[PDB]
């Protein structure tokens, strides 16, 4: 239709393709980060779980003393929701 | 010059090159949402555990005066790291 139109029919198509390579590329990097954020979370779950487990042990160890502070702690440990 | 079959192939070829990019973005955006559920589901557990540890911290702090070595052992665990 125009000599300079075929220039912007060529360029429009080129820039449309570009934004797809820029999507795949940045979707690939977001994706990589999420894989590491998932490993970091699984690590923090264990780290916290370890603490709660050792705290449970110290409480079971002192069952005899019937300290109501330890019972309050145990009530927290075995809580739900 | 342009053969009637080279214009049939140049068409299909492009229409396929574009098709593998939409199929990449698609499956990449699918994988991305599956990672997002995974990380939010893990973070929910992190928060549940964090909540207990934090409430336990408060109890040890309000009994600071008691100087109970059991509580000190407990706060030692709370502030502990692997180094």
Author numbering:
A (entry chain B): 26 to 106
B (entry chain A): 25 to 107
The authors write:
In contrast, the 1-70-Eb1 structure features an opened-up, ‘unzipped’ coil1A segment, even though the presence of the Eb1 cap keeps the two chains together at the C-terminus. The observed unzipping is especially interesting with respect to the possible mechanism of longitudinal IF assembly. The large differences observed in the dimer structure and crystal lattice contacts between the LA 17-70-Eb1 and LA 1-70-Eb1 structures are most likely due to the different crystallization conditions, rather than a consequence of the complete head being retained in the latter case. Indeed, since the head domain in the LA 1-70-Eb1 structure is almost entirely disordered, it does not seem likely that it plays a major role in the formation of the antiparallel overlap of two coil1A dimers. In fact, the N-terminal opening-up of coil1A dimer is the most pronounced in the LA 1-70-Eb1 structure, followed by a smaller opening in the vimentin structure and a completely regular CC geometry in the 17-70-Eb1 construct.
Lamin A (LA) and its splice variant lamin C as well as two closely related lamins B1 and B2 jointly form the lamina, a meshwork of ~3.5-nm-thick filaments located at the inner side of the nuclear envelope. Like for the whole IF family, the basic constitutive unit of the lamin filament is a rod-like dimer which results from a parallel coiled-coil (CC) structure.
